[PDB]
Amino acid sequence: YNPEFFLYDIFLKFCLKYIDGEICHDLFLLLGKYNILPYDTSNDSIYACTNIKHLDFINPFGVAAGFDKNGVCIDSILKLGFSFIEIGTITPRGQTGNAKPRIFRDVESRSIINSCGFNNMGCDKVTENLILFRKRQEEDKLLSKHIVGVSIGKNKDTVNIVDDLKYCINKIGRYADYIAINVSSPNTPGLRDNQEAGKLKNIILSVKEEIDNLEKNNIMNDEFLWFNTTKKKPLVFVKLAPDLNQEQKKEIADVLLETNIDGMIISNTTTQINDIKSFENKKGGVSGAKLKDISTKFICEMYNYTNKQIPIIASGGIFSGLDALEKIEAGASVCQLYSCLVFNGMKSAVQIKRELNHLLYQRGYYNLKEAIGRK
Ligand SMILES: Cc1cc2nc3c(=O)[nH]c(=O)nc-3n(C[C@H](O)[C@H](O)[C@H](O)COP(=O)(O)O)c2cc1C
Ligand SMILES: Cc1cc(Nc2cc(F)c(C(F)(F)F)c(F)c2)n2nc(C(F)(F)F)nc2n1
Ligand SMILES: O=C(O)c1cc(=O)[nH]c(=O)[nH]1
């Protein structure tokens, strides 16, 4: 509604029409880096707060992983009106990823296909970006209480998947509110097989353990140990790909229950969309509108399978207050956006927060927490 947002969104639409996606993506990241994007300075509704365990979100919308892989634009992105962002996915060593162009959008179906292949500057460089973010944060009143999770993964050619995760934890864990374990990218060969249950249980317990050791091995009080938002050790979530068996899902559910994981991100992109014409050429995982139903059903299933015991972070095809309410009613406690920013632009968090609040009122819910899981 504001003019700053209005002008940027025209520009963004122009870019969407004329300019390659990855290039546009990076241009807006660079404009955020230089602090020339608009801010949402509005108080968020106390009735749409949410939490995962003791991690509290001032509103229920965050930016999904893969958006700001390297943490170069964290302040500007949160300042668009998001309560949190998941940076990464990061790996121990930097990787260039797959040959470009490797991201395409289909404006008509509001859908995206990418085969990025975990391109990122590497754990050490991103840790230094996140540290500078944490320092800015102590000085920047609009960043107070905003959450930064870190998605962490394996280098493509890795000796020890678990070892890669430990290396990332050891480096960046002190600066993270939460850690997301990503064994779900379509785009690194294998990796996805790391969703095998015995393997996954060991992954999850190795990660909680490396985090536990961060707490142990240093002498400072928590307030100085955790240079993050919570002042507590990061929670542990796992991100799940939606292309799985019911049996696979049930198995994963039991490993999540067995290991007392703090949450699950449902879901990553799908390789099962066949009917987007412009994508016929293409290899990779599809995001956006055409993922929404698959992702929502998957939320229902895992909530059920896990007996409502594991909080869900929703991802996939969320554009509108209605889409968000569906995620929440299926069982999600919090939502992440990606595609919506691409097609709808900079106003997305402002607009969707407003839409969800009105909806919550119309359906006669007292607050958002009351709606979670109401089938
Ligand atoms: C270009 C691109 C890169 C992505 N990179 C990652 C990543 O590094 N890690 C990750 O867990 N998910 C990644 N994703 C998946 C998103 O985090 C998200 O789950 C997916 O886009 C579904 O949300 P959407 O339908 O709102 O876009 C990426 C998606 C896109 C489109
Ligand atoms: C016009 C456009 C913009 C976009 N990225 C983008 C990147 C951004 F940083 C923002 C912002 F500023 F709000 F945080 C944004 F709204 C969109 N991508 N990203 C793609 C991608 F990644 F899918 F290729 N295509 C795009 N097209
Ligand atoms: O780097 C990527 O290719 C990528 C990672 C991921 O987790 N999901 C995705 O769709 N792409």
Curated annotation (Swiss-Prot):
Please list the residues that bind substrate. Answer: K69, N114, S115, C116, G117, F118, N182, N187, N268, T269
Q: For this entry, list what GO says about its biological process.
A: 'de novo' pyrimidine nucleobase biosynthetic process; 'de novo' UMP biosynthetic process; pyrimidine ribonucleotide biosynthetic process
Q: Which catalysed reactions does the entry list for this protein? A: (S)-dihydroorotate + a quinone = orotate + a quinol
What binding details are noted for the cofactor?
Binds 1 FMN per subunit.
Co-factor(s): FMN
Its annotated pathway reads:
Pyrimidine metabolism; UMP biosynthesis via de novo pathway; orotate from (S)-dihydroorotate (quinone route): step 1/1
In the record, what terms sit under GO molecular function? dihydroorotate dehydrogenase (quinone) activity; dihydroorotate dehydrogenase activity
**Topology relative to the membrane:** Single-pass membrane protein
- Mainly resides where? mitochondrion
E.C. number: 1.3.5.2
Task: Report the active site residues.
Answer: S185 (nucleophile)
Naming one, the record's GO cellular component terms include: mitochondrial inner membrane
Q: Which UniProt keywords apply?
A: Flavoprotein, FMN, Membrane, Mitochondrion, Mitochondrion inner membrane, Oxidoreductase, Pyrimidine biosynthesis, Transit peptide, Transmembrane, Transmembrane helix
Top-level taxon in the UniProt lineage: Eukaryota
- Binding-site residues, FMN: 65-69, 89, 182, 239, 287-288, 315-317, 338-339
Q: Does the keyword Oxidoreductase apply?
A: yes
Subcellular localization is given as: Mitochondrion inner membrane
Q: What does this protein do?
A: Catalyzes the conversion of dihydroorotate to orotate with quinone as electron acceptor.
Subunit organization: Monomer.
The record's comment on protein family reads: Belongs to the dihydroorotate dehydrogenase family. Type 2 subfamily.
The name this protein carries in UniProt is Dihydroorotate dehydrogenase (quinone), mitochondrial
Query: What is the source species?
Result: Plasmodium falciparum (isolate 3D7)
The portion of the full protein included here is 161 to 565 of 569
